[PDB]
Design an enzyme around this catalytic site. Structure first.
Site, PDB file in Angstrom:
ATOM      1  N   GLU A  86      -5.993  23.430 -17.996  1.00  0.00           N
ATOM      2  CA  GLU A  86      -6.456  24.776 -17.302  1.00  0.00           C
ATOM      3  C   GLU A  86      -5.369  25.725 -16.927  1.00  0.00           C
ATOM      4  OE1 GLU A  86      -8.520  25.715 -13.121  1.00  0.00           O
ATOM      5  OE2 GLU A  86      -8.555  23.537 -13.720  1.00  0.00           O
ATOM      6  N   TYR A  87      -5.519  27.063 -17.137  1.00  0.00           N
ATOM      7  CA  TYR A  87      -4.561  27.831 -17.022  1.00  0.00           C
ATOM      8  C   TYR A  87      -4.747  28.388 -15.591  1.00  0.00           C
ATOM      9  CZ  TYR A  87      -2.864  32.804 -16.780  1.00  0.00           C
ATOM     10  OH  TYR A  87      -2.690  34.159 -16.342  1.00  0.00           O
ATOM     11  N   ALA A  88      -3.523  28.501 -14.765  1.00  0.00           N
ATOM     12  CA  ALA A  88      -3.752  28.796 -13.430  1.00  0.00           C
ATOM     13  C   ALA A  88      -2.853  30.197 -13.495  1.00  0.00           C
ATOM     14  CB  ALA A  88      -2.783  27.646 -12.458  1.00  0.00           C
ATOM     15  N   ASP A 131       4.440  10.514  -6.343  1.00  0.00           N
ATOM     16  CA  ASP A 131       4.919  11.757  -5.723  1.00  0.00           C
ATOM     17  C   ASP A 131       4.298  12.874  -5.943  1.00  0.00           C
ATOM     18  OD1 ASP A 131       6.041  12.335  -7.965  1.00  0.00           O
ATOM     19  OD2 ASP A 131       8.016  12.484  -7.573  1.00  0.00           O
ATOM     20  N   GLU A 135       6.626  21.824  -7.402  1.00  0.00           N
ATOM     21  CA  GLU A 135       6.626  22.535  -8.665  1.00  0.00           C
ATOM     22  C   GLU A 135       5.591  21.755  -9.614  1.00  0.00           C
ATOM     23  OE1 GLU A 135      10.537  20.045  -9.086  1.00  0.00           O
ATOM     24  OE2 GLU A 135       9.309  20.644  -7.304  1.00  0.00           O
ATOM     25  N   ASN A 136       4.771  20.812  -9.177  1.00  0.00           N
ATOM     26  CA  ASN A 136       3.718  20.455  -9.545  1.00  0.00           C
ATOM     27  C   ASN A 136       2.397  20.909  -9.221  1.00  0.00           C
ATOM     28  OD1 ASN A 136       5.234  18.985 -11.531  1.00  0.00           O
ATOM     29  ND2 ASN A 136       5.137  17.158 -10.415  1.00  0.00           N
ATOM     30  N   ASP A 149      -0.074  17.191 -11.677  1.00  0.00           N
ATOM     31  CA  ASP A 149       0.789  16.017 -12.061  1.00  0.00           C
ATOM     32  C   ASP A 149       0.596  14.757 -11.525  1.00  0.00           C
ATOM     33  OD1 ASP A 149       2.740  14.470 -13.871  1.00  0.00           O
ATOM     34  OD2 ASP A 149       4.414  14.969 -12.665  1.00  0.00           O
TER      35      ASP A 149
END
Ligand SMILES: Nc1ncnc2c1ncn2[C@@H]1O[C@H](CO)[C@@H](O)[C@H]1O
Length: 259
Positions: A86-88, A131, A135-136, A149
């Site tokens: 999926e593009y965010a 975790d 950045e995820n 992630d």
């Protein structure tokens, strides 16, 4: 569920990761816009992760939730592995954080409500994560948070310790309480601008997590200090349940979203 390169037109790079890059792409027949993460078999085989990526993909395939990034499918060619994602449109929380330096109590509280909802759903499927880092985390067109992630998610050294709990760096057995610790680390970073155990050295960061040593800057309010203090406890038994987090008077007063 049968795909190949010739089905997609490839666009600009969305990010350049460890094992490969993520590109904007469009499916030719339907014109659906999406993201395509291309991975080298070389960097994967030669790291001993080729079994993990297998199971992580299986797991994420079967999840459906507005706060978790969707995985549509996957395939492979001569030398590479391709993931259809999926593009965010609004990018990573990480980039947003270094543009603004800090988030206010309203945005922080709303992000955490969204996270707790997605973690309650995952736990009902017996899915956890090792975790969760900025950045995820990705943002949708309405600016709502999406978890991208899993890491090691159930159905020397390479990594930073900043987001791991004490019971995982010390070797011990862990349960879904690991996620509650992650909520706390993120709530701190959203308000302060950096994670609570940051240090110049891996060895030193280890000590700080193990001893749970963190301090608050003057501008962090008592309502926020309380939630965070309750979340970061050495003993996993003493951390609160997800529904309690969603009912905290600090969340309640500052959040835009229902539980
Ligand atoms: N669907 C996506 N939309 C936007 N950026 C993405 C997407 N998937 C991955 N990325 C970027 O690529 C990096 C590698 O996964 C991420 O940290 C993020 O910056």
């Amino acid at each position: 569920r049968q795909w190949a390169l010739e089905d997609f037109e490839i666009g600009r790079p969305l990010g350049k990761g460890k094992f490969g890059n993520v590109y904007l792409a469009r499916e030719k027949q339907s014109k659906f816009i999406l993201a395509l993460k291309v991975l080298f078999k070389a960097q994967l085989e030669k790291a001993g992760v080729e079994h993990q990526l297998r199971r992580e993909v299986e797991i994420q395939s079967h999840l459906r939730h507005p706060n978790i990034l969707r995985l549509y499918g996957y395939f492979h060619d001569a030398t590479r592995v391709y993931l259809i994602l999926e593009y965010a449109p609004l990018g990573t929380v990480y980039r947003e954080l270094q543009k603004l330096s800090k988030f206010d109590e309203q945005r922080t509280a709303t992000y955490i409500t969204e996270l707790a909802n997605a973690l309650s759903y995952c736990h009902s499927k017996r899915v956890i994560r090792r975790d969760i880092k900025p950045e995820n985390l990705l943002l949708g067109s309405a600016g709502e948070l999406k978890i991208a992630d899993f890491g090691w998610s159930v159905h020397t050294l390479c990594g930073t310790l900043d987001y791991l709990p004490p019971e995982m760096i010390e070797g011990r057995m862990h349960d879904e309480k690991v996620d509650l610790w992650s909520l706390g680390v993120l709530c701190y970073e959203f308000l302060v601008g950096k994670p609570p155990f940051e240090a110049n050295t891996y060895q030193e960061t280890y000590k700080r997590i193990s001893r749970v040593e963190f301090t608050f800057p003057d501008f962090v309010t008592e309502g926020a200090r309380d939630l965070i203090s309750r979340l970061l406890k050495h003993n996993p038994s003493q951390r609160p349940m997800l529904r309690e987090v969603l009912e905290h008077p600090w969340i309640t007063a500052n959040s835009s979203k229902p539980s």
